[PDB]
Amino acid sequence: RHMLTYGAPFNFPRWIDEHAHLLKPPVGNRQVWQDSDFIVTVVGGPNHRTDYHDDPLEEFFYQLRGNAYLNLWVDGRRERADLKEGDIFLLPPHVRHSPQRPEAGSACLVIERQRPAGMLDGFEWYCDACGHLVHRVEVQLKSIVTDLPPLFESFYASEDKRRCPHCGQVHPGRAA
Amino acid sequence: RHMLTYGAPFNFPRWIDEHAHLLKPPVGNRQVWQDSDFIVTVVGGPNHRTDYHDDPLEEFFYQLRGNAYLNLWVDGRRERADLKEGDIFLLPPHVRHSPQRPEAGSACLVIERQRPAGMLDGFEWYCDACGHLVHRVEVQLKSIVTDLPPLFESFYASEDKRRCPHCGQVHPGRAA
Numbered sequence: 001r002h003m004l005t006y007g008a009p010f011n012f013p014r015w016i017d018e019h020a021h022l023l024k025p026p027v028g029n030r031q032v033w034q035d036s037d038f039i040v041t042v043v044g045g046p047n048h049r050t051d052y053h054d055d056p057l058e059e060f061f062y063q064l065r066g067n068a069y070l071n072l073w074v075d076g077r078r079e080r081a082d083l084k085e086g087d088i089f090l091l092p093p094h095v096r097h098s099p100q101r102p103e104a105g106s107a108c109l110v111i112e113r114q115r116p117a118g119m120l121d122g123f124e125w126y127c128d129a130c131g132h133l134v135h136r137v138e139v140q141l142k143s144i145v146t147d148l149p150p151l152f153e154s155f156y157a158s159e160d161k162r163r164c165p166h167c168g169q170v171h172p173g174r175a176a
Numbered sequence: 177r178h179m180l181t182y183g184a185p186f187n188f189p190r191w192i193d194e195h196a197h198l199l200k201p202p203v204g205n206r207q208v209w210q211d212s213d214f215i216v217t218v219v220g221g222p223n224h225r226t227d228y229h230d231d232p233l234e235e236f237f238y239q240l241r242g243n244a245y246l247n248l249w250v251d252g253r254r255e256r257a258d259l260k261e262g263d264i265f266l267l268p269p270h271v272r273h274s275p276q277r278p279e280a281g282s283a284c285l286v287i288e289r290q291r292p293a294g295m296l297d298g299f300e301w302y303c304d305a306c307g308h309l310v311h312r313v314e315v316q317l318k319s320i321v322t323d324l325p326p327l328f329e330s331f332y333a334s335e336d337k338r339r340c341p342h343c344g345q346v347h348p349g350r351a352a
């Protein structure tokens with residue numbers, strides 16, 4: 001049997017307007033369709049964050065409204081990829097990325113794939129003093145809204161998780 | 177090693193403008209990045225076509241400029257999904273769809289996944305008189321620009337492939 005499981009086409013700019021109040025703290029983002037293989041999200045702002053995501057699959061970005069940027073590790077060095085309003089970008093698997101979204105009213109279309117069982121996501125923090133990895137957690141990712149907060153929260157709550165194994169500096173946690 | 181395999185972010189509306197001359201007959205569409213798992217295409221117009229695509233994976237559409245529509249089979253009946261300017265839409269696997277793009281200067285972002293070996297695409301034509309399937313070809317799809325034309329062309333060239341097995345009507349081929 002063949003039906004439109006994810007419903008009919010609809011106007012995207014009006015959808016974003018109607019969901020603006022989720023596109024800001026404390027929720028910040030909203031998945032468009034549920035139970036699909038393509039995970040299609042709109043991400044708003046402001047939001048800053050200190051974690052780097054290690055995604056085993058690609059991520060597509062289209063910065064529809066306002067500006068944002070990705071903090072990256074590429075070739076072993078910190079780098080910044082700007083997502084200016086109107087930019088698209090395709091992130092290869094496993095490139096560590098920390099999205100920074102300073103602007104209220106911004107909106108970024110992000111498209112990712114459901115990860116199959118056994119294909120784990122990583123979330124990493126790095127030492128601001130020496131660049132060493134401080135902590136990494138791997139998760140079988142099923143839902144961004146519900147599987148990521150307890151993970152981030154347990155990092156911020158633990159001086160041990162935040163302690164750099166190389167230089168001893170305790171990572172600040174949330175605001176950095 | 178981690179590098180930006182698909183390059184830096186770039187402005188999408190300017191990209192579309194610079195490629196407009198491919199976004200019209202006879203080429204009509206243009207893939208954004210090569211060798212990626214996400215196949216990201218912009219599709220222009222005008223183009224009409226008589227084949228229905230049976231994609232084993234989902235397809236995402238965002239009709240950025242102008243209007244288009246999909247002829248579908250849903251629940252056993254012909255249906256039309258309009259892609260009005262600004263619409264997004266997620267097509268479930270295996271829903272038969274025939275994109276119609278009447279407008280010059282239109283532009284639709286379409287995102288699909290590379291199919292793994294063994295996961296075949298289908299291209300089907302149906303009888304305008306009785307609705308029966310006339311012909312189906314399955315392909316291991318590697319490149320839309322190069323694997324689809326010889327397939328369509330061999331249908332248009334064969335009265336036998338075009339002959340409805342139920343009512344005997346010969347399908348018109350290209351213009352229908």
Ligand SMILES: N=C1C(C(=O)O)=CC=CO[C@H]1O
Pocket residue numbers: 029041043053055059099101108110112144
């Ligand atoms: N890239 C993602 C972000 C973001 O702010 O860009 C938030 C939630 C969607 O998917 C992420 O991997």
Ligand SMILES: N=C1C(C(=O)O)=CC=CO[C@H]1O
Pocket residue numbers: 205217219229231235275277284286288320
């Ligand atoms: N949907 C597709 C189309 C289209 O015109 O919509 C053309 C080439 C890209 O991917 C197709 O499956």
Ligand SMILES: [Fe+2]
Pocket residue numbers: 127128129130131132164165166167168169
């Ligand atoms: Fe350190």
Ligand SMILES: [Fe+2]
Pocket residue numbers: 303304305306307308340341342343344345
């Ligand atoms: Fe027929």
Ligand SMILES: [Fe+3]
Pocket residue numbers: 053055059097
């Ligand atoms: Fe990510």
Ligand SMILES: [Fe+3]
Pocket residue numbers: 229231235273
């Ligand atoms: Fe298709």
Ligand SMILES: [O-]
Pocket residue numbers: 053097099
């Ligand atoms: O991310």
Ligand SMILES: [O-]
Pocket residue numbers: 229273275
């Ligand atoms: O298609």
